[PDB]
Amino acid sequence: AMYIKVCGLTDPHAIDAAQAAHVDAIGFVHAPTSPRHLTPPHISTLTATVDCTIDTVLVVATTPIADALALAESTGVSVLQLHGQYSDDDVAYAAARFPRVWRATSLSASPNLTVGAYGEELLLLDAPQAGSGHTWDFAALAHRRPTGRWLLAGGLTPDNVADAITTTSPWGVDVSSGVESAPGVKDPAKIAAFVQAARGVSCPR
Length: 205
Description:
The structure is a monomer. Helices cover 30% and strands 21% of the residues. The protein has 205 residues and is of the alpha/beta class. The strands form 2 sheets. An 8-stranded parallel β-barrel has the order 1-2-3-4-5-6-7-8, surrounded by 4 helices. Helix 1 (12-20) runs parallel beside helix 6 (188-202) and helix 5 packs parallel to helix 6 (188-202). It starts with a strand and ends with a helix. Residues 5-197 form the N-(5'phosphoribosyl) anthranilate isomerase (PRAI) domain. Its EC number is 5.3.1.24. It is an enzyme of class 5 (isomerase).
């Protein structure tokens, strides 16, 4: 299996493309510093339109952890995803209080790469430079790949994802900017292309 999350969706037009491509998760960003930012009322309505074949994920960065928990509850999302600003203590505080918590980090932050170290269900590892060249720099992951449930991120696009999955064999992938036509505007054609490229590694057609 290869779990696919599209992160930072902001409209039904994008949700429809994600459902048509049978993605596994959709992220809704609540982070006022991001071009993908959504207010609580908007996250609530968007979340309610997604069917039970997709995990909905509230993605936060700067929201005090108790408020983030309250927002996860009120919006009805499946998962609370915490960006790397959050302390280890905050990750575990959340994990005790909400059923599904994801810990995001990046390789440059020298993170703890053991999944579940602080109560999280899954670790999202962002390796933004690994796609800077013509081919995917699988050396940047390699011995650092978690043994547990994790998502690879790092500027994934329809153009690099087959290479990334083939060489790095992640448990799943997370994509955002690489399927946008503009910041905060997901492009249905790119979503479809991304999923085709990613799934074609194990099930080419």
